[PDB]
């Protein structure tokens, strides 16, 4: 007989975490943050509802790469105009927009569904050691790595 618990908006409790990016590898931090955003760390995980938590990433400018990714990892985008292929290196992106660097890295590890877009909207990335969400009282979170 059917007995499996199903979370819903009436019983889900979403928390706030702050994660320090300084000294961390890009994708290794990113995959754990993606897990947190999707509620995979909750015993009440329910695939059709958002059980995940809010994540604040600080010190985005201090994220680290291995190898020659600073100059050899390239981000491409197309403008949907006949020759509109544009590019930027991972190093130049880290220099000029580290919040975009980390946000894109994390969102690339979330489903492209409606729920996935909603869950990615719970991510807040900042290049420095400060964030404006003191009112939500985030708790420090340590990556298992």
Partner 1 sequence: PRVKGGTVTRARRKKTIKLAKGYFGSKHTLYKVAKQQVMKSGQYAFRDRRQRKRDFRKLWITRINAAARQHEMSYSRLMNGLKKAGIDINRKMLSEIAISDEKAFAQLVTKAKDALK
Partner RNA sequence: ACCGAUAGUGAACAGUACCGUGAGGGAAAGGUGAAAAGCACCCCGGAAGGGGAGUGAAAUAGAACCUGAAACCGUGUGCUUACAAGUAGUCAGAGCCCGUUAAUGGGUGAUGGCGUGCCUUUUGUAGAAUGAACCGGCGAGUUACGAUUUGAUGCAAGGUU
Partner RNA sequence: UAACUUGGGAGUCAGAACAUGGGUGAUAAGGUCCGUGUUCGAAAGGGAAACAGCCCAGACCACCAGCUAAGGUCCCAAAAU
Partner RNA sequence: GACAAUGGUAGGAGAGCGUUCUAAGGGCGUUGAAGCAUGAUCGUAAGGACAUGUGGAGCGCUUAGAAGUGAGAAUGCCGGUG
Q: Where does this chain bind RNA (CB under 7 A)?
A: 1-4, 6, 8-10, 27-28, 31-32, 34-35, 38, 40, 47-49, 108-117, 144-145
CB of 43 to RNA, least distance (A): 12
- Sign of CA pseudo-dihedral 59, 53, 123, 78: positive
Spatial distance between the Cα atoms of 49 and 30, rounded to a whole number of angstroms:
22
- Cα(30)–Cα(24) distance, integer angstroms: 10
31 binds, among RNA, partner 1, none (CB under 5 to 8 A by kind): RNA
Binding partner at 49 among RNA, partner 1, none, C-beta below 5 to 8 Å by kind:
RNA
81 binds, among RNA, partner 1, none (CB under 5 to 8 A by kind): none
Distance CA 62, CA 119 (A): 25
* Largest CA-CA distance found in the chain, in angstroms, rounded: 59
Whether the Cβ atoms of residue 14 and residue 133 lie closer than 8 Å to each other: no
Stretch of residues binding partner 1 (CB under 8 A), selected from 34-42, 71-79, 100-108, 127-135:
34-42
Torsion of CA 46, 29, 26, 137, to 10 degrees: 90
Choose between 10 and 87: whose C-beta lies nearer to RNA: 10
- Binder among 9, 13, 43, 113 for partner 1 (CB under 8 A): 43
Residues that bind partner 1 (CB under 8 A): 3-5, 40-47
């Amino acid at each position: 007989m059917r007995q499996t618990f199903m979370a819903n908006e009436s019983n889900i409790e979403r928390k706030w975490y702050v994660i320090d990016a300084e000294g961390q590898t890009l994708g290794r931090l990113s995959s754990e943050v993606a897990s947190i955003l999707r509620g995979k760390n909750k015993v009440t995980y329910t695939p059709h509802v958002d059980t995940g938590d809010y994540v604040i990433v600080i010190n985005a400018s201090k994220i680290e790469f291995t190898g020659n990714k600073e100059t050899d990892k390239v981000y491409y985008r197309h403008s949907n105009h006949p020759g509109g292929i544009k590019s930027i290196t991972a190093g130049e992106l880290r220099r000029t927009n580290p919040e975009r660097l980390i946000e894109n890295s994390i969102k690339g590890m979330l489903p492209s569904t409606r729920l996935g877009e909603k869950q990615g909207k719970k991510l807040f990335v900042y290049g420095g050691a400060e964030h404006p969400h003191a009112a939500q009282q985030p708790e420090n979170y340590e990556l298992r790595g």
